[PDB]
Design a binder for this molecule. Structure first.
Ligand SMILES: OC[C@H]1O[C@H](O[C@H]2O[C@H](CO)[C@@H](O)[C@H](O)[C@H]2O)[C@H](O)[C@@H](O)[C@@H]1O
Lengths: 62, 62, 62, 62
């Protein structure tokens, strides 16, 4: 979809090229699964895309 | 020191060469706690060295 | 239904008799999503049925 | 009373006697981090005491 799917809960500052920087409460759009325990997403606040540790975000209320 | 400082609470599978693999409850000797929220540590179970997202581990208690 | 509906993302060790024990990645068949934010499900790995805090599992990515 | 140790990230409505009700963002003073992944704590907003699933809260003051 095009709507927010997750919200970051921990600050994440990249050290690697493919990573997505996160600020607490950052809205995230995740569209694929993980397996690696890493999520690939679009940060709706910064407009950047990349991966981050899966447990650094929570699915938006259901 | 050389005693456990933290315990992993989330599974972490390295995606990058410098990362440290973690399994929940792994005893960790955290040596570096960096400004960018990445921690450098020795995994006391596996014997490996590497970095991982800071919030994947919590300090030991008691 | 007879195919996985949700995936457990945190380990959950029951403290009460009606709870369903969970291990990360456990394939769950959620049969009821209660209004008090607890899910009733069948654990496809253990063959047991029980309840657990709703946020311990996420819907599978179709 | 000591200082806040954790913050609730998920809504938790008790179904059992000994449980502590949580609202997202509730300040928590965790007195015991049990080995069965349940936390015994004081809810600094409601003033209540009880247990809750460990992964429903995150540590503060990293
Ligand atoms: O293994 C996935 C299926 O698990 C259940 O069904 C099986 O488990 C039953 C008892 O719990 C057995 O009697 C049956 O023979 C097993 O195949 C579930 O009911 C199915 O819907 C799942 O696909």
């Amino acid at each position: 979809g095009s709507e927010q799917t997750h919200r970051a809960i921990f600050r994440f500052v990249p050290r690697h090229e493919d990573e997505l920087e996160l600020e607490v409460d950052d809205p995230l759009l995740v569209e694929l699964q993980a397996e690696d325990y890493w999520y690939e997403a679009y940060n709706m606040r910064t407009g950047a895309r990349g991966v981050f540790p899966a447990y650094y975000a929570i699915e938006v209320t259901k």
